Amino acid sequence: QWALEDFEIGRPLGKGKFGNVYLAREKQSKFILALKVLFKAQLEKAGVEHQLRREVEIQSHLRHPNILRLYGYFHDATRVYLILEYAPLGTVYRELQKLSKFDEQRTATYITELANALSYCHSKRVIHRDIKPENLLLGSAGELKIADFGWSVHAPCGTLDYLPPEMIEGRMHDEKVDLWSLGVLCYEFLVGKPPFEANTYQETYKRISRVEFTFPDFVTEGARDLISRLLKHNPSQRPMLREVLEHPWITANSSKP
Ligand SMILES: Nc1nc(Nc2ccc(S(N)(=O)=O)cc2)nn1C(=O)c1c(F)cccc1F
Numbered sequence: 001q002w003a004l005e006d007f008e009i010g011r012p013l014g015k016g017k018f019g020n021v022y023l024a025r026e027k028q029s030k031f032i033l034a035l036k037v038l039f040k041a042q043l044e045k046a047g048v049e050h051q052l053r054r055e056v057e058i059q060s061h062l063r064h065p066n067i068l069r070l071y072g073y074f075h076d077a078t079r080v081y082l083i084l085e086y087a088p089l090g091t092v093y094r095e096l097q098k099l100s101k102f103d104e105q106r107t108a109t110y111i112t113e114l115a116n117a118l119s120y121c122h123s124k125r126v127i128h129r130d131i132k133p134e135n136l137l138l139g140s141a142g143e144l145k146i147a148d149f150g151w152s153v154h155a156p157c158g159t160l161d162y163l164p165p166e167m168i169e170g171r172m173h174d175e176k177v178d179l180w181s182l183g184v185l186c187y188e189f190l191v192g193k194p195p196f197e198a199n200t201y202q203e204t205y206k207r208i209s210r211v212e213f214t215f216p217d218f219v220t221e222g223a224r225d226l227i228s229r230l231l232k233h234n235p236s237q238r239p240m241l242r243e244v245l246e247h248p249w250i251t252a253n254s255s256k257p
């Protein structure tokens with residue numbers, strides 16, 4: 001059904017990893033989209049063809065306005081191509097580099113968008129596991145969209161900043177993992193760096209396992225309450241997504257249609 005000849009390739013949007021993403025237009029429909037181009041070689045060498053086929057199967061059925069659509073896929077002798085939705089405002093990662101942190105309104109909005117997408121996800125027993133600013137895209141109305149579904153499996157790596165303790169220790173993990181990740185995002189959005197950043201993987205491991213973060217002065221009590229509630233070692237004490245969406249700090253600072 002799909003072949004490279006159906007697309008006009010524009011410029012690069014980002015680089016792999018297993019491969020690069022390019023802006024592209026489908027020739028017939030003039031539909032603008034993004035093409036992830038993974039090389040079969042790396043995929044084979046890192047042994048991820050199995051997880052990719054998983055991710056692709058998971059991603060193609062999901063329909064939510066805060067989740068990035070996969071429209072389709074194809075492959076050539078030397079490449080696998082994924083046909084993704086193009087998010088025209090880029091990564092949250094890069095937006096954060098530009099602003100050196102977000103105000104409460106933007107943060108509370110992003111966390112609402114994210115918790116909604118995660119409610120939808122958990123209600124199909126899909127745990128993301130990789131929520132991080134490099135995987136968060138922004139649509140044309142500046143709305144957050146989760147991308148990069150790889151690294152996620154039906155319930156129950158590089159830098160370890162976004163992982164909860166029960167996952168870096170190799171233990172059992174459920175949906176509560178994504179709640180930890182939100183607390184790490186919420187922190188990084190407000191402060192400009194994640195709460196357990198360190199110069200080495202080995203220090204970050206320690207900081208996560210022992211739950212060692214301090215708030216700078218500009219962080220308000222309502223932000224400190226929700227972050228502290230999300231960053232609990234016992235997955236059981238983390239709140240549900242609904243408690244998060246109804247948190248007084250969120251309700252007071254977020255945005256709603
Ligand atoms: N699907 C998708 N759309 C975008 N949009 C986008 C728009 C602008 C820029 S910028 N400011 O030029 O660097 C970058 C990306 N990225 N994208 C991806 O899959 C994607 C991703 F998830 C992470 C990194 C790179 C990507 F390419």
Ligand SMILES: O=C(O)c1cc(-c2cccc(Br)c2)nc2ccc(Cl)cc12
Pocket residue numbers: 040041043044049052053056073074075080
């Ligand atoms: O030659 C193939 O049949 C091959 C196909 C695919 C693939 C096909 C459809 C969807 C998706 Br998602 C991936 N992935 C590969 C990854 C590595 C290697 Cl060595 C080969 C493949």
